[PDB]
Amino acid sequence: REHWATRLGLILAMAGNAVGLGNFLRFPVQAAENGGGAFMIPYIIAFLLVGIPLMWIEWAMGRYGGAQGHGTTPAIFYLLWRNRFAKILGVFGLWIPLVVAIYYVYIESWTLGFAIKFLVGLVPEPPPTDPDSILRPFKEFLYSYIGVPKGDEPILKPSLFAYIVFLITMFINVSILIRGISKGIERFAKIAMPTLFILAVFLVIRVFLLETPNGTAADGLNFLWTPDFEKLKDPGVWIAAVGQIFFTLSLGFGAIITYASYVRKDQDIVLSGLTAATLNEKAEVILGGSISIPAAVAFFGVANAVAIAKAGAFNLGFITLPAIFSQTAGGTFLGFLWFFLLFFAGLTSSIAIMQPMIAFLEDELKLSRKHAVLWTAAIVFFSAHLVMFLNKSLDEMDFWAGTIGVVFFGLTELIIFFWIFGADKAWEEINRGGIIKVPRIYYYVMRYITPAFLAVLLVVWAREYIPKIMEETHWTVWITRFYIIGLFLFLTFLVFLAERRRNHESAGT
Ligand SMILES: CN[C@H]1CC[C@@H](c2ccc(Cl)c(Cl)c2)c2ccccc21
Numbered sequence: 001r002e003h004w005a006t007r008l009g010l011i012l013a014m015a016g017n018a019v020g021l022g023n024f025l026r027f028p029v030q031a032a033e034n035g036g037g038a039f040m041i042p043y044i045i046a047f048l049l050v051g052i053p054l055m056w057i058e059w060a061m062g063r064y065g066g067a068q069g070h071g072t073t074p075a076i077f078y079l080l081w082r083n084r085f086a087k088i089l090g091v092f093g094l095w096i097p098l099v100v101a102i103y104y105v106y107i108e109s110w111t112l113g114f115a116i117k118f119l120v121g122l123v124p125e126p127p128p129t130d131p132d133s134i135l136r137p138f139k140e141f142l143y144s145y146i147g148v149p150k151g152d153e154p155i156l157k158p159s160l161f162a163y164i165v166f167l168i169t170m171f172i173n174v175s176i177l178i179r180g181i182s183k184g185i186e187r188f189a190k191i192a193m194p195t196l197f198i199l200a201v202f203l204v205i206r207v208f209l210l211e212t213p214n215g216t217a218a219d220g221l222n223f224l225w226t227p228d229f230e231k232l233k234d235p236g237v238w239i240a241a242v243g244q245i246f247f248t249l250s251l252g253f254g255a256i257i258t259y260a261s262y263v264r265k266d267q268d269i270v271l272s273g274l275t276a277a278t279l280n281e282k283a284e285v286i287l288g289g290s291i292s293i294p295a296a297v298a299f300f301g302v303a304n305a306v307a308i309a310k311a312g313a314f315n316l317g318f319i320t321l322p323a324i325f326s327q328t329a330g331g332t333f334l335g336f337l338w339f340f341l342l343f344f345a346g347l348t349s350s351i352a353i354m355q356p357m358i359a360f361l362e363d364e365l366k367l368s369r370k371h372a373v374l375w376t377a378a379i380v381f382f383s384a385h386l387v388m389f390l391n392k393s394l395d396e397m398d399f400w401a402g403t404i405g406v407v408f409f410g411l412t413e414l415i416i417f418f419w420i421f422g423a424d425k426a427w428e429e430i431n432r433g434g435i436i437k438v439p440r441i442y443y444y445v446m447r448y449i450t451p452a453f454l455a456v457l458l459v460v461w462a463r464e465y466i467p468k469i470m471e472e473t474h475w476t477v478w479i480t481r482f483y484i485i486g487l488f489l490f491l492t493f494l495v496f497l498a499e500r501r502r503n504h505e506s507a508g509t
C-alpha cells in the first residue's frame with residue numbers, strides 16, 4: 001500500500017483536504033446570514049462536540065482499514081460490522097464525495113477562469129460612486145461566465161472559456177492524482193499550503209487597510225466576533241453551524257477516512273488529526289473570516305453586507321469582493337490573488353474527494369492507479385455537465401450529498417465504529433500509536449453526546465425545515481435526484497462486483 005512519506009507532508013495534505021472553498025466562500029456567507037457573532041457560539045460548540053471527535057474517529061477508521069488494504073467505507077464498514085447492510089451504508093462514502101466533486105470541481109474551475117481573466121486584465125470596467133453602477137458590471141461578468149438563465153427555462157449556458165477552463169481544471173486534478181499519494185497529493189500539498197497561507201495573509205492585511213465613509217474592516221470583525229445570546233434559542237443557527245463544521249473539516253465525505261488509510265499502522269493520528277483540524281479552523285475563522293466580511297462591511301456597512309450574503313452563495317466572493325477591490329489601486333491584481341488563492345484552496349480539496357473513488361477502484365476492483373484516476377475523472381467530468389447546464393442542479397446535489405448526506409454519514413460512521421464495533425475497541429484503536437492521548441472526557445462525548453447531538457439535529461432538520469423544500473421546488477430537481485440516485489445504484493453494483501471478484505480470488509488462492 002501507498003503511504004505518506006513524511007509527517008509534515010501528511011499534515012499539510014490533510015490540511016489541504018480541509019482548507020478549501022468552505023473556508024473562504026462558504027464560511028463568510030453562513031456566518032453573515034446567521035448574525036455574525038451569533039453564529040460563532042454554536043460554531044465553536046459544534047467544533048468541540050462534533051468536529052474534533054469525528055475527525056479522530058475518521059482518522060482511526062482510515063488507518064485501521066488501510067492496515068488491511070482497504071481505504072473506503074464499503075469495505076471498512078464491513079470490517080467493523082460483518083453485515084451486508086454495512087457494505088450498502090458504506091456506499092455513501094463513495095457516493096457523497098463523488099457527487100460533491102461533481103459540482104465542487106466546477107466551482108473550483110470558476111476561480112481558475114477568474115484568476116486568468118483578472119491576471120490578463122480582461123475584467124469589467126466600472127464608471128470612474130453609485131454602488132449599483134460598480135456592482136452590476138461584476139454581476140454581469142459572473143452571469144455571462146456561468147450562463148445564468150435570462151428567461152423562463154432552467155437552462156445554463158456557460159461561456160466557451162468557462163467550459164475549456166473546466167477541462168483544464170479536470171486535467172490539473174488528474175495530473176496530481178495520477179502521480180499518487182506521496183509524489184502527487186503530498187508533494188503538491190507542500191507547495192500549495194504555504195502559497196495559500198501567504199496569499200491569504202496578504203489579503204487580510206490589504207483588507208484591514210480599507211476605510212470608507214461607510215465603515216472600516218474593524219466594523220466587520222466586530223460584527224463577526226460580537227456574541228448574540230438571543231440567537232442561541234434559534235435552531236436554524238445551530239443547524240447552519242454544524243453543517244459548516246462538517247463541510248469545512250471534510251467530515252462525512254469519506255475523504256478523511258481514505259487519506260488516513262495511507263497512514264502507517266503505527267503512526268500517530270491523535271496529534272496529527274488535531275493539528276489538521278486546528279490548522280483548518282485558523283484558516284477559517286482568522287483568514288477566511290477576515291477577508292470577505294470586513295471588506296464588505298467597510299464599503300457598505302453591516303446591514304448591506306448581510307443582505308449581500310443572503311442574496312446567494314457566490315455573490316460575496318465572485319461579485320462583491322472583486323467590485324470592492326476594483327475601487328483600489330492595483331485592485332485587478334488583488335482580484336487575481338484572491339481567485340488564485342481560491343483555486344489552490346479548491347484544488348487541494350477536490351483531489352481529496354476524488355481519491356475515495358480512486359481508492360475503491362484500486363483496493364477493491366484492483367485497477368492500476370492510472371486507470372482508477374482516469375475513470376474517476378471521466379465519471380466526474382461527464383456528470384458535471386448536469387451541474388454546468390441545468391439551473392439549480394448544483395443546489396440539489398449540495399443539499400443531498402454536501403449537507404444532509406454528511407451529517408447522516410457522520411452519525412452512521414460513529415454508530416458503526418463506537419457502538420457496534422465496540423466503544424472500548426474504538427477508543428483503543430484511536431489512541432494506539434498516539435503521541436498524545438485523547439482527553440478522557442471525549443470517550444463520553446464520542447459514545448453519548450455526539451450521536452445524541454446529531455440525532456436531535458437531524459430530527460429537527462427533517463421535520464421543521466426540509467418539507468418546505470421537497471414540495472416548493474421546480475420540477476427539474478427530479479432530473480438531478482434521478483441522476484444521483486442512479487450514481488448510488490451504479491456504485492452499489494460496483495460493490496457487488498468487488499465482493500464477487502473476492503469470491504473468485506478466494507476460491508483460487
Ligand atoms: C445548502 N446549500 C447552499 C449553502 C452552501 C452553498 C455552497 C455549497 C458548496 C460550496 Cl463549495 C460553497 Cl463555496 C457554497 C450553496 C451553493 C449553491 C447553492 C446552495 C448552497
Ligand SMILES: CC(C)C[C@H](N)C(=O)O
Nearest residue numbers: 018020021022248250349
Ligand atoms: C468537500 C470538502 C473537501 C470541502 C472542504 N473541506 C472545504 O472546506 O472546502
Ligand code: NA
Nearest residue numbers: 019345348349
Ligand atoms: Na483545499
Ligand code: NA
Nearest residue numbers: 018019020248
Ligand atoms: Na475547510
